[PDB]
Amino acid sequence: TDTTPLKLSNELYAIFKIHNRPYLVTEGDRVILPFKLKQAEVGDILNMTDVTTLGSRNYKLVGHPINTSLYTLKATVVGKTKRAFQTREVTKRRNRRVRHAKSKGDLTILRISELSMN
Amino acid sequence: ESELAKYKEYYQGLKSTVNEIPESVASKSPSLRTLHKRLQLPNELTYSTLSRCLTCPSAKLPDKINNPTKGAAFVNTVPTNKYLDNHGLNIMGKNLLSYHVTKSIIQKYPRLPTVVLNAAVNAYISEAVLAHIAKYWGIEVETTSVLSRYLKMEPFEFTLGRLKFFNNSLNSKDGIELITGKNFSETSALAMSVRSIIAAIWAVTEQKDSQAVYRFIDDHIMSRKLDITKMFQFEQPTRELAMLCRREGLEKPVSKLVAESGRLSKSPVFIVHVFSGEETLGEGYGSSLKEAKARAATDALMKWYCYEPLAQQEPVIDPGTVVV
Amino acid sequence: VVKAIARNSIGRNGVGAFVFPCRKITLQFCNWGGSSEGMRKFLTSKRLDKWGQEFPWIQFEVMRKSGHPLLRAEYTNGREKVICVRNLNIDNVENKLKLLKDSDGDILRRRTKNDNVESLNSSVRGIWSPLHAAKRHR
Amino acid sequence: VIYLHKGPRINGLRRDPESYLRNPSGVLFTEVNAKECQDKVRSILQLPKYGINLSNELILQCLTHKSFAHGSKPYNEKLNLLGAQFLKLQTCIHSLKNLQFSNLGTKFAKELTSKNTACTFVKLHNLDPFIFWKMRDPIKDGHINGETTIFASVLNAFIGAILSTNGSEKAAKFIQGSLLDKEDLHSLVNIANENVASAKAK
Amino acid sequence: KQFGFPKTQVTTIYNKTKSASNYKGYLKHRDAPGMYYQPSESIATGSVNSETIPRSFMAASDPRRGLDMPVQSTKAKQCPNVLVGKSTVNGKTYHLGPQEIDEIRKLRLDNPQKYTRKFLAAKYGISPLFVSMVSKPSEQHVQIMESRLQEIQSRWKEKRRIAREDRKRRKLLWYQA
């Protein structure tokens, strides 16, 4: 795998997958995962492993989780939080009982700190 | 006994602590400790030094205290020691910022125009930006009065931990500012504090790890996003491009239609490329032909200036700005 | 001729040095007031010390007031969450405190489907153009 | 007919290249030689002492001012700016050493990082004939033409070039040695002291 | 061609002509592991990207010069000239001496209405721009012209003034990049 053009390029993107959910990122990008991370606390660093595609403007090294050795991709866990609280009402059409379906899903804000060809 | 006497002795004690910044007292201050932990400051940087960095110069109380009727009262801070303030530190921090940031910018963009470079530097380390950074860190201002503190009967540790300058009480009450100098502005004080911290870090680490300060700066200041492409504003870019081509060993640039669609409409699209020989320099789209031509020239100039070489390359020293 | 446009940088907290979002937490309780029992118990019982030991970048203020028991956090962005912990047991209070510390200070907000990444950066590949496409349309 | 103008100014008319490619000394920009100029400059600056290595082209750029040849040939400005920034920091650390923080906001320190001081240093070292620039009015003292500012720029431009090429530590060492040193006596510190003394007298 | 990577379109599993906006099809499309050449489907106007900068603007010691990415897709022979000056088509001429220039200057001051820039250009086989560069008119004439322009501007409606402002804003925006 001649990964020389990617290495050379100033701009570079990645399409890493957390639980098969793809997230297309550059360095500085701020990923918002739609679940509560249990493993990592806030401040902890995540070394991304299932990286599908690593792309320049005109090239890309894509395939099965590309060899991690070839690259680095460090995210930082920058705040567990939640979505806004919502209460949709559930009811049938001639029925006074109206069940409130309250919802307030969890979020985890990551920040892509490092992304480079090793 | 008398309560005035009790207050007076408390005030005197506070003044003495400010003059000293005794190390034990500084250590006891929770806010300072939390700031230290937050920024991951070196262990060699003592808590007294950190307190000092938050202490702005304030030798004599000004003449504007005499009248709150004219829209100012300075009743929060207490006079400081002449040889234990953030003033010398601040200057050193400013110098460091001016050196390192500028150097980093030059490394990134070795042909960047002088004015553009200056603007970028400003963006990275402007007073407002520095103040914002300080706020983010948690450098809070001593807004509460001395008398109020005494009444609450709070320790001097808390005072030491907060930022200390001649902050005007009733600054914007009833929507009336007084427009005083830089020595009474909050933003300026916050900027000084962030520069003073940097200077303190430098002082402690220089002999052991010389580049510790610069990596701290990189982490905090140089980590911030700035698209350099948004900084530019050209005037007659075609002429400038032609001059650049003349200067280098390049053929005269001419603009040519590559592709065209919707001529005789409200919003056409004209793609023109500024060629020098067979090589294209700049690609320019536009609603009009003229616009497209202009855009191609601007693109070419961007490519010239914002060229960022690799770290593996030997240093690129540019041949100055293209003097049209 | 070239001229600058005065512009300021954007801080990305994570990339260089991570500044921890939660800066200060205030535990507020009442000596009277049966709603403040669990808070009082928490304050008493060696959990707060452990917490402070764990997180020395947060300062932990402890205040007494007449009203309901309060947990007000204070973040780097300047926002302030305030959770009323009325009638909660020790463990519930601790969980609330954990939640607060976890939060980046930003306001709560509805996200649309797949609104995942938030970039300041220009696209690495360009924006599409019909003139410059690989397969021309018809 | 290719009339290249070769005399006083006609507004809008292009000149013969040789009419504007000469410094006040009177050497052609293309005709500069390594043996006769750049080597001499290196020797003056003692670049073999501090492990320094500048390119001949780089040296020439450092020497030449924006006013020379309408910024056509590579001119010191960005380098100068860089050098000034480094120099001021270097002066501050020197002051701190000679930990003190109460000797920065002062006259001597300002003079050390000043433009006049830099010019005097340049004059002493005899780099003034080598630099490339255009005088405002040839028949003047020198200060009227803006000589001092250009000399200061040159001094700082060299520093900026050193920073760019040979790293930061090396540059600092050079600053400590050639400038900012009591043993030379035509160093920057000595000049600053002399200026201070003159100010006191006046 | 330095690199011999296989090249790929930005491939959907669905019909691209009917469902170009459908991200799901793109997500589905897996391609075999390795290096590829995906040429960008974009103009390189705003890009500071290293794959976009031309080789002449790269430094001599740049490794990127040798690599084939600033692709010369267009050809200058095929493209026609746009808003090109007559000097660029048939070369610049430096024929007029000092005396001729002095005469031109004398003429222009004397009577700019009779001896206008275009007329001077026609006479001496040179550009109106060059005439302007050479010679100032009588400042009175300039003042008159400014006054005429002001009068014309006043003669506008509200709408026209707004349109002119918009045009000016657009022009300013063009030179931003």
Nearest-neighbour CA in chain C from A94: distance (Å): 31
Residues of E at the C interface, defined by Cβ within 8 angstroms: 9-10, 16-17, 23, 38-44, 46-47, 49, 176
Whose CA is closest to B54, among B167, B146, B182, B189? B189
User: CA nearest C127 in E: which residue?
Assistant: E42
Please state, in angstroms and rounded to a whole number, the distance separating the CA atoms of residues B209 and E177.
41
- β-partners of residue B12 are none
Locus of tokens 């997500």 = E27
Please state, in angstroms and rounded to a whole number, the distance separating the CA atoms of residues B87 and B56.
7
Please state, in angstroms and rounded to a whole number, the distance separating the CA atoms of residues E52 and D48.
41
Please state, in angstroms and rounded to a whole number, the distance separating the CA atoms of residues D68 and D63.
10
- β-partners of residue B254 are B275
Cβ contacts of E7 within 8 Å, gap of 6 or more:
E36, E37, E38, E39
Contact B135 C58 (CB under 8 A): no
E85 contacts in chain B (CB < 8 Å): none
- β-partners of residue A18 are A21
Please state, in angstroms and rounded to a whole number, the distance separating the CA atoms of residues E52 and B307.
10
Distance of CA A8 to the CA centre of its chain: 25
Contact D12 E97 (CB under 8 A): no
Judged by DSSP in three states, C36 sits in helix
Taking a C-beta distance cutoff of 8 angstroms, is the pair B254, E88 a contact? yes
Contact E134 D11 (CB under 8 A): yes
Using CB atoms within 10 A of its CB, is residue A108 exposed (0-12), middle (13-18) or buried (19+)? buried
Please give the DSSP secondary-structure letter assigned to residue B73: B
Whose CA is closest to B36, among B129, B137, B135? B137
Taking a C-beta distance cutoff of 8 angstroms, is the pair D18, E111 a contact? no
Cβ contacts of B16 within 8 Å, gap of 6 or more:
none
Counting one residue from A and one from B, how many pairs have CB atoms under 8 Å apart?
3
Cβ contacts of B68 within 8 Å, gap of 6 or more:
B170
Contact D66 B87 (CB under 8 A): no
Taking a C-beta distance cutoff of 8 angstroms, is the pair E47, C126 a contact? yes
Contact D74 B88 (CB under 8 A): no
Longest dimension (CA), chain E: 79
Query: How was this structure obtained?
Result: cryo-EM
What amino acid is encoded at D138 in this protein? P
What amino acid is encoded at B4 in this protein? L
What is the bridge-based pairing of β-strands C59-64 and C22-29? parallel
DSSP assignment of chain D: ----B-SS--TTPPBPGGGSSB-TT--BSTT--IIIIIHHHHHHHTTTTTT----HHHHHHHH-BTTGGGG-S--BSHHHHHHHHHHHHHHHHHHHH----SSSSSHHHHHHT-HHHHHHHHHHHT-TTT-----SSSSS-STTTTHHHHHHHHHHHHHHHHHHHH-HHHHHHHHHHTSS-TTTSSSHHHHHHHHHHHHHH-
Test the C interface: residue of B34, B140, B157, B228 with most C CBs within 10 Å = B34
Subunit partners of chain D (3 or more CB pairs within 8 A) = B, E
Whose CA is closest to C133, among B98, E10, B272, D3? E10
Angle at E93 between CA E87 and CA E98, to 5 degrees: 135
Counting one residue from B and one from C, how many pairs have CB atoms under 8 Å apart?
115
What is the bridge-based pairing of β-strands A51-55 and A59-62? antiparallel
Helix D78-97 and helix D168-177, axial crossing angle in degrees, nearest 10: 60
Please state, in angstroms and rounded to a whole number, the distance separating the CA atoms of residues A115 and A54.
10
Subunit partners of chain A (3 or more CB pairs within 8 A) = B, C, E
Taking a C-beta distance cutoff of 8 angstroms, is the pair C30, C86 a contact? no
Nearest-neighbour CA in chain B from C121: distance (Å): 8
Query: Would you tell me which residues 83-112 of chain D have a C-beta closer than 8 angstroms to some C-beta of chain E?
Result: none
Please state, in angstroms and rounded to a whole number, the distance separating the CA atoms of residues E125 and E151.
34
In this complex, does chain D touch chain C, defined as having at least 3 beta-carbon pairs under 8 Å apart? no
Please state, in angstroms and rounded to a whole number, the distance separating the CA atoms of residues C52 and C76.
18
Nearest-neighbour CA in chain B from A10: distance (Å): 8
Please state, in angstroms and rounded to a whole number, the distance separating the CA atoms of residues E61 and E63.
6
Whose CA is closest to D145, among D126, D158, D131? D131
Taking a C-beta distance cutoff of 8 angstroms, is the pair D50, D165 a contact? no
Query: Would you tell me which residues 9-38 of chain D have a C-beta closer than 8 angstroms to some C-beta of chain E?
Result: 10-14
User: CA nearest A23 in E: which residue?
Assistant: E27
Whose CA is closest to E40, among A1, C136, C124, B257? C124
B225 contacts in chain A (CB < 8 Å): 28
Distance of CA D25 to the CA centre of its chain: 16
Whose CA is closest to E58, among D64, B279, B271? B279
Subunit partners of chain E (3 or more CB pairs within 8 A) = A, B, C, D
In this complex, does chain B touch chain C, defined as having at least 3 beta-carbon pairs under 8 Å apart? yes
A86 contacts in chain C (CB < 8 Å): 110
Q: Taking the CB of residue C33, how many other CB atoms lie within 10 A of it? A: 16
Q: Answer positive or negative: Cα dihedral of D119, D121, D126, D130.
A: negative
Q: Answer positive or negative: Cα dihedral of B67, B71, B76, B80.
A: negative
DSSP assignment of B205-274: HTTT-TTHHHHHHHHHTTTSB--GGGGEEESSHHHHHHHHHHHTT-PPEEEEEEEEE-SSSSS-EEEEEE
Helix D56-63 and helix D147-166, axial crossing angle in degrees, nearest 10: 150
Contact E33 A4 (CB under 8 A): no
Please state, in angstroms and rounded to a whole number, the distance separating the CA atoms of residues A105 and A113.
25
Contact C110 A32 (CB under 8 A): no
Q: Taking the CB of residue B120, how many other CB atoms lie within 10 A of it? A: 24
- β-partners of residue B164 are B55
3-state secondary structure chain A: CCCHHHHHCCCCEEEEEECCEEEEECCCCEEEECCCCCCCCCCCEEECCCEEEEECCCEEEECCCCCHHHEEEEEEEEEEEECCCEEEEECCCCCCCCEEEEECCEEEEEEEEEEEEC
In chain E, which ranges are continuous DSSP H helix? 23-28, 86-89, 98-110, 117-124, 128-134, 139-155, 158-174
Locus of tokens 């701190």 = D96
Nearest-neighbour CA in chain E from B155: distance (Å): 55
Please state, in angstroms and rounded to a whole number, the distance separating the CA atoms of residues B192 and B80.
16
Q: Give the gyration radius of chain E's Cα atoms.
A: 28
Cβ contacts of E5 within 8 Å, gap of 6 or more:
A2, A59, E34, E35, E36, E37
Please state, in angstroms and rounded to a whole number, the distance separating the CA atoms of residues B268 and B283.
17
Taking a C-beta distance cutoff of 8 angstroms, is the pair B110, B87 a contact? no
Whose CA is closest to C24, among B31, B32, B149, B53? B31
Please state, in angstroms and rounded to a whole number, the distance separating the CA atoms of residues B3 and B9.
10
Q: In degrees to the nearest 10, what's the CA dihedral of A21, A25, A29, A32? A: -10
Please state, in angstroms and rounded to a whole number, the distance separating the CA atoms of residues B197 and B266.
58
Please give the DSSP secondary-structure letter assigned to residue B160: H
Judged by DSSP in three states, B55 sits in strand
Distance of CA D150 to the CA centre of its chain: 7
Locus of tokens 């021309």 = C136
Please give the DSSP secondary-structure letter assigned to residue B123: H
Taking a C-beta distance cutoff of 8 angstroms, is the pair B9, B156 a contact? no
Please state, in angstroms and rounded to a whole number, the distance separating the CA atoms of residues E72 and D8.
46
Residues in chain D whose C lies over 2.5 Å from the next residue's N (breaks after): 98
Test the A interface: residue of B40, B310, B313 with most A CBs within 10 Å = B310
